[PDB]
Amino acid sequence: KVFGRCELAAAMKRHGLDNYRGYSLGNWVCAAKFESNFNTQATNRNTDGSTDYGILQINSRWWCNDGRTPGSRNLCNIPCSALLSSDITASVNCAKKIVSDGNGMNAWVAWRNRCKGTDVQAWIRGCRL
Ligand SMILES: [Cl-]
Ligand SMILES: [Cl-]
Ligand SMILES: [Cl-]
């Protein structure tokens, strides 16, 4: 599913992501924009052989099981395929664990490089929330 911008903001809020660990909704929408362009089915293969999955490009090295990332963990206790669903529940619940892991949203390199320090509220501007 490719979400609309406000549609995704609303779904993220529904699932308790808004201001989670102090990160406003615009941060999460911005991260999703640059990680996946709002596409739940996004996948990307990393140089180390791990894969990033879903709207927030969650990585199989630590967070989910895909059966093909040697030496990896599955800390969200989910198959990586669950992160590709039209229902963002699994991605949100896993993101909550990731952002609580110590480095906040810096876990998402694209958030650090493209969202951090910017006017992230622009991502939810106009949205009925
Ligand atoms: Cl915001
Ligand atoms: Cl594996
Ligand atoms: Cl980047």
Swiss-Prot record:
Q: Which cysteines are joined by disulfide bonds?
A: C6-C127, C30-C115, C64-C80, C76-C94
Q: Which organism is it from?
A: Gallus gallus (Chicken)
Gene3D superfamilies xref list: 1.10.530.10
Task: Name the keywords, alphabetized.
Answer: Allergen, Antimicrobial, Bacteriolytic enzyme, Disulfide bond, Glycosidase, Hydrolase, Secreted, Signal
The UniProt GO MF terms for this protein read: beta-N-acetylglucosaminidase activity; identical protein binding; lysozyme activity
What domain of life does the UniProt record list for this protein's source?
Eukaryota
Where does it localize? Secreted
Q: How does it assemble?
A: Monomer.
The entry's protein name is: Lysozyme C
Q: Which InterPro entries match?
A: Glyco_hydro_22, Glyco_hydro_22_CS, Glyco_hydro_22_lys, Lysozyme-like_dom_sf
Query: The C-type lysozyme domain covers which part of the protein?
Result: 1-129
Q: Which residues does the entry assign to the active site, renumbered to this chain?
A: E35, D52
- EC numbers listed for it are 3.2.1.17
What is the tissue localization of expression for this protein? In the egg white and polymorphonuclear leukocytes.
Q: Give a Pfam family name.
A: Lys
Q: What does this protein do?
A: Lysozymes have primarily a bacteriolytic function; those in tissues and body fluids are associated with the monocyte-macrophage system and enhance the activity of immunoagents. Has bacteriolytic activity against M.luteus.
In which residues is substrate bound?
D101
| GO BP term (any one) | cell wall macromolecule catabolic process
Q: Which reaction does it catalyse?
A: Hydrolysis of (1->4)-beta-linkages between N-acetylmuramic acid and N-acetyl-D-glucosamine residues in a peptidoglycan and between N-acetyl-D-glucosamine residues in chitodextrins
Q: What is its main location?
A: secreted
- Further remarks about this protein from its record: Lysozyme C is capable of both hydrolysis and transglycosylation; it also shows a slight esterase activity. It acts rapidly on both peptide-substituted and unsubstituted peptidoglycan, and slowly on chitin oligosaccharides.
